[PDB]
Symmetry: D2
Subunit: 395 residues, 4 copies
């Protein structure tokens, strides 16, 4: 209590508290400190089961408790992938009512029609520093030096990690006398944020020194020059991709569309065109889709992905096309940063959710990516199919 | 146990369980079922203190338990707003290490430099159906009729809601023979997703019948025509706004920048230009900022906003400018859908987090928006200031 | 010749030359001055017929001659518009081979199938200053003051012209403490650039003074704050429109598609979807079309529109849809700044081209807009139809 | 005269005339025809000095005469480039009054402050077909085969041209089962439109046949899949570049800014930020500049570039920054398709304008690009400086 009063008088700050007291009671002191300031008592945030010692060290600061997100599932979901095969029951954490049911309805239709074909198109994590040079003349020299000494930069970056591998520096953007080199890494099963920052920092320190020997002065202004692009919607991510780039598709027969979706293939194609394609074009949107962010969001929260990367997962294009025997229906997500180790996957509830998919640990990120894509297709098909019903009726 | 076997044999579906057995036990049964399919045991997801019966009816389906997100706070954060005044301790739920510490550092620097000036610029929620007409001739007629009969459409829309007010139908986009009317509503303290869908649907039925009397056949293809725009990044939202449009500002003197941020106003201006402005411009990004999505995400999860709306909050522009007396630093977030009742705010842990802000219930959505903007500035200032420190050092 | 030597020694500059000598010989002196510097003789740029006295005063500075652009035509083009009715032969000036022939082929198909239905959706010209305020608090006051005193601002702006009319100030954008008010004008038949700058300048001087009386200090940084948006591709123009917003459409029967286009309606829809819709989405394009800029460009050069406004005319969306009896095919151009008086319409060759359309002078801009839209449809249909042939064959 | 009547009766079409009569008289005949349909007489369009026979074969169809665009110049313009060195007088064809005067003012200010530093950053032309495959499985196979067999595709592509070199196929975009390979060519001094279409078509025929041997069926839907991107504004062009990518720079001392621009370096930086950067950001524009399209347009018309490529040249970013010794000012144009042979450069008046620059013919496209960038900077500097003058005055 004397500590609590020193917190109120601000002789001691909440951040330094963990060294004066145990970490378990550190959470209670912080929880009661902010309760007294706000004049409100809490019952729920203080009741959790995750490991507070490890959470403080890797996942959060100034911990006062935990929030609880309702967890449901959608399934069964038959997937025909390179890494995911069989039927999956997918966990989904959300506070939006009807979202899990919409995906679950999509999973059932897809599974009864043979499952989703899905493939990972690309797999990379990127970091794009901004480097200042004295003039455009140096910016050109800097760019051409990078491209011709890539193997040297690759050894320097890779000496910082047992798990990362630098595969490219492309594109290299120049605006005036500023250079934005997009370092491209393989990250194994980690999402790779921390690894690509450390590998790129050493790479940039090395470039700066090597160029200084050639009488060219540069310096990195910031390791993230907003050309990565990280946690913002960007054309560079839509085009070049980031994280996992995933495509999932199904072919449905006309009789399956009538039986399970209660509609027709031309209606589905019309809805997709008027809404997902034309509607996104005229409002200058980067999401030519209906529901990716919602499905990405629910699956990311359950499995401990970075919540801000829902921004990146909202990019993409749904294609629905009439075929002779029914529809072709596909989702394309060029920008899905996921991982099955590190980050939030270590928090206990999220670990269990990955275990229910068989996707926690090493050699599982590509499997998890394929599940992500199949789940998005299932849910995008459910939503687009339900809209085509109302479309048919009203017409 | 007999039922567990009937689930494995697929005699009964998981969705039908809540009525045969208690909803409390429905959750445990379908968790045993997912455990037996994946052949793995769980220990943590089964712990939940939240009310499962109402969560099943309003927030989730096929519930098996709960995910737990670590919850911290950042503060103190002094805010000079129209609705938020005083020092706030902002709760933040995240799994990303160091994020809360970065915002917590920003809150303290700003607080002892006088607090954050914040204003809500706009407050509205939108729904934009796709309407098919026979031809551009009818599409033009439709647009003009909407503009002419707006008051009547307004009364039909408002008859479905006690809090919703239809204030505009603008812009009204036409592509070929397709019409995308952007209905603009006031929603009170709700985020407004469900209110604007019910109000817009009856309005569209009324437009369709009134036009049929003039022998003009239209029909709504979908109540969401992707011109809203909802849960996607779009120029219409960046320009016209959606949800709350928030702006936060601070003026810092050169002596405060040196003492608290360990840098100068020139370096902060330089970082912001090269990274937030030029960097976003050349990569064709709509987020001319460093950290909005990260901060929005942590606050949205803690307070029960919709997770997919982090997409909308990642839009915006950070401005940092050298002034005679220091630096001017501001964030602009034109597209922040928040609510203090309904949706996920009902979930107990998230409700308590709104209570810690004094932002649960009616007449508090604008207070909450001002807190959101002040927190984003605090963290955006922390990050940019930390980058300008490295910037100066490497220059020397 | 003594003047020529003073030009070489730079005692006198080319700009001040018109007061020392006649304007006719001013052009010859400038032409020979730059010839001597470059050590090349010219024969063509010096042979023209346009009025040099008026061109110097309204269209060009430092004139040395004229460039000649080949002029052809496309037709007949039957148009079913509110202002354009009947068959038109459209002049087109270009240096690209096959462009006029592609449009001419489209005009013939369309005319044999009943002509193009076209309508002007909107008609406005805009100017968006950037105004600096001391703080966001003032920026809000500034915005709310503008909206509540619009009638006062409208009288002030309109006192500068007999032809402009201020119809709106919307949207009003605020970034931090900077305010971007989009002034919206009717301009009659002029494109309106010069009128909206003069009307807006007086409007801003008045706002600045009125706000100063209320103890709020603002000042306009620039009358064009890049939110207009003028001569750049922008979502605000795509969504809110600028200049003329035009939509043209045709319905074609299946037998007409086979007979005149040598293809089918599903092929046309497939080409449009894969190329104009999906291809533009994945490359993050604002032109969901094939050929607008080319057709806009050829028609603008012939009739004296501002060449940089081809940027704005490249925006838009082509929709091609299977119907029970054939196709629906439409073009949407939300951003087409044109005029039938002022600007370049006064240069003699361009005046004649507008006369061939019956579109020079007052009360003709909307007629000309409808012709622009019908011409773009004709050419977009020709190009998309020719691609669907190769598509059918290769499949 | 008898033929004139057969045109009015539609017995013969205008296109068939060039073979029955001389092409010189074909032009006069079909002008009489358009005159008689519109019931109006023309006097000016019938004057042309250009070679009509070759223009009819390479530049135009259904020719009736010529349009005349007023031609001026701006100079002197001192350029410090890799390929352009010395003082240039830049010809500019326009109907917009005051534009040439604005650039002419910029050229003189820069010239006596030391000239424009300019560099060509990149030089390539692109064509991106749409290829349909049966499924994403085959689309992945197709992408990997292209990457694996690039050298063979390169030899097939280069067999169609003496100047074209295929240097890359990147990026290779996949949407569903559709594949958009961006072929990247060197084109010498041509703009490359026609060369990259012929080379890419044979390359695609070769890919299609080689995949058929492995029992994988693909087919090119169109040689231009709108991912090129050609004559539209697109992020892929802003990011990866197309045509010439040009950057021009000047450093100006505070004393030169005061004396020649009548302003200060702070005001220039402020205008550029509020207008070119923030203004373009909030309106979702891809042109973070004031005047590129205007200057590009006048130069493109004078020198015979494609008018529709003004769309591509309007992209880019202007940077103005306070330096210890004055201001740094630069323009970046990542997407400028130019050529010095072929296309419209052949037209006589435009050829003479290239000659006035010493840029007609082979080994001069890079010189011409450097001149383009220096002219855009000169005019962009003139405009922004003129806006900063008004800025300072109204502030006082
Ligand atoms: Cl060099
Ligand atoms: Cl106030
Ligand atoms: Na409740
Ligand atoms: Na020739």
């Amino acid at each position: 209590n004397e500590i609590l009063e020193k917190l109120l008088k601000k002789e001691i700050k909440p951040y330094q508290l963990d060294d004066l007291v145990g970490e378990k009671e550190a959470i209670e002191l912080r929880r009661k400190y902010i309760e007294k300031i706000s004049q409100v008592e809490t019952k729920h945030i203080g009741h959790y089961t995750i490991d507070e010692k490890e959470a403080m060290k890797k996942n959060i600061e100034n911990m006062i408790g935990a929030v609880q997100i309702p967890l449901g599932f959608a399934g069964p979901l038959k997937i025909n992938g390179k890494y995911a095969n069989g039927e999956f029951y997918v966990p989904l954490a959300t506070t939006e009512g009807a979202l899990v049911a919409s995906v679950n309805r999509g999973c059932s239709i897809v599974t009864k029609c043979g499952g989703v074909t899905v493939r990972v198109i690309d797999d990379k994590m990127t970091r794009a520093p901004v480097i200042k040079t004295e003039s455009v003349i140096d910016a050109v020299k800097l760019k051409e030096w990078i491209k011709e000494n890539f193997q040297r930069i690759k050894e320097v970056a890779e000496s910082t990690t047992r798990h990362g591998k630098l595969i490219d520096i492309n594109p290299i953007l120049i605006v005036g006398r500023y250079v934005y080199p997009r370092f491209v890494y393989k990250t194994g099963d980690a999402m790779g944020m921390n690894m690509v920052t450390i590998a790129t920092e050493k790479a940039c320190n090395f470039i700066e020194e090597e160029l200084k020997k050639e009488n060219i002065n540069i310096h990195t202004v910031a390791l993230s020059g907003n050309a990565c692009v990280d946690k913002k919607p960007a054309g560079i991510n839509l085009i070049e991709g980031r994280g996992k780039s995933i495509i999932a598709e199904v072919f449905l027969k006309e009789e399956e569309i009538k039986k399970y979706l209660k509609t027709t293939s031309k209606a589905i194609e019309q809805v997709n065109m008027y809404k997902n394609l034309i509607g996104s074009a005229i409002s200058n949107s980067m999401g030519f889709n209906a529901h990716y962010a919602n499905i990405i969001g629910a699956l990311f929260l359950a499995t401990g992905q970075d919540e801000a990367h829902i921004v990146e997962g909202s990019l993409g294009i749904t294609v629905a096309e009439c075929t002779e025997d029914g529809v072709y229906f596909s989702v394309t997500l060029p920008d899905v940063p996921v991982g099955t180790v590190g980050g939030g996957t270590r928090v206990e509830t999220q670990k269990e959710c990955l275990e229910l998919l068989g996707c926690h640990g090493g050699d599982k990120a590509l499997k998890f990516a394929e599940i992500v894509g199949a789940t998005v297709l299932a849910g995008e098909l459910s939503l687009i199919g339900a809209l085509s019903v109302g479309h048919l009726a009203r017409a």
